[PDB]
């Protein structure tokens, strides 16, 4: 009994440990969010399938690492879902063919927000999985420890909804003018969703965001967002109605807005935060 990975590392007969580098594509599912499915990443085989049968379980102590350790989740091992980190060894999976077959493990994240997310830097430890192998022949009891590393920069969604982009940049025409903000949201299942804006503002209305450009900032101007022509103040929940699996647009358009005094030539920049909420 031995194992291989897709990224080119293996653990021999007797067990050991190995580093697994995986491309992450986290998505929201209903009631739980997928972090990574390792069944296409890790494979094992039986060396004497005609005579011996290997028993493979997900040992206890299997946990998230790095930043994700602060979250509770579930793990799908061969069709049934168990709490993650595992506090108990899962039931056995039978292994009986020389051909390398998947280790059916998929790590999920329990939702905690509406559309929130957590940033994972590439090279980060994201999990430590322990595979315990035994048989019906002798008294063998081996450990295969898998250190899962993130191959890429990603945001793992922690909510029941997801955005088209976590960080957006749009460019206005030279003053005066406006431009649409392509930004949509979808949910794993139907949710009554809403969002509100965040940022530093210059007006009593709390709607005109300050120009925080570092070099040659144009004075007298700021940015103001609209939806259907209506100005959106900061910290005021914009209701979207029901949002399902189909992406729904936030309907935002960025416009210039005068702050006070003379408008002079120069750069304009405004960072605006968007937070989603259930209604």
């Amino acid at each position: 009994f031995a194992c291989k990975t897709a990224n080119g590392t293996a653990i021999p007969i007797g067990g050991g440990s190995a580093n697994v580098y995986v491309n992450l594509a986290p998505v929201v599912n209903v009631g739980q969010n997928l972090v990574v499915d390792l069944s296409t990443q890790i494979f094992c085989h039986n060396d004497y399938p005609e005579t011996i049968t290997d028993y493979v379980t997900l040992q206890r102590g299997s946990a998230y690492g790095g930043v994700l350790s602060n979250f509770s989740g579930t793990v799908k091992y061969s069709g049934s879902s168990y709490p993650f980190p595992t506090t108990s060894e899962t039931p056995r999976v039978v292994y009986n063919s020389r051909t390398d077959k998947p280790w059916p493990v998929a790590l999920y994240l329990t939702p905690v927000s509406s559309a929130g997310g957590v940033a994972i830097k590439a090279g980060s430890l994201i999990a430590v999985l322990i595979l315990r192998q035994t048989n019906n022949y002798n008294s063998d009891d081996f450990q295969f420890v898998w250190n899962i590393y993130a191959n890429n920069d990603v945001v793992v969604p922690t909510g029941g909804c997801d955005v088209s982009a976590r960080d957006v940049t749009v460019t206005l025409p030279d003053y005066p003018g406006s431009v649409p903000i392509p930004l949509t949201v979808y949910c794993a299942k139907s949710q009554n969703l809403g969002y509100y804006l965040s940022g530093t503002t210059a007006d009593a209305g709390n709607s005109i965001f300050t120009n925080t450009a570092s070099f040659s900032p144009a004075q007298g101007v700021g940015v103001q967002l609209t939806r259907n022509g209506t100005i959106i103040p900061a910290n005021n929940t914009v209701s979207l109605g029901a949002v399902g699996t189909s992406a729904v647009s936030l309907g935002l358009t960025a416009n210039y807005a005068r702050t006070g005094g003379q408008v002079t030539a120069g750069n304009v920049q405004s960072i605006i935060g968007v937070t989603f909420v259930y209604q």
């Binding site: 957006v168 749009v170 460019t171 003053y175 965040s198 960025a254 002079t264 030539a265």
Partner: peptide, 13 residues
């Protein structure tokens, strides 16, 4: 914040 929008612009003359 769940998402961040960066709006860039210029005033020319």
């Amino acid at each position: 914040a769940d998402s961040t929008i960066t709006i860039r612009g210029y005033v020319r003359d």
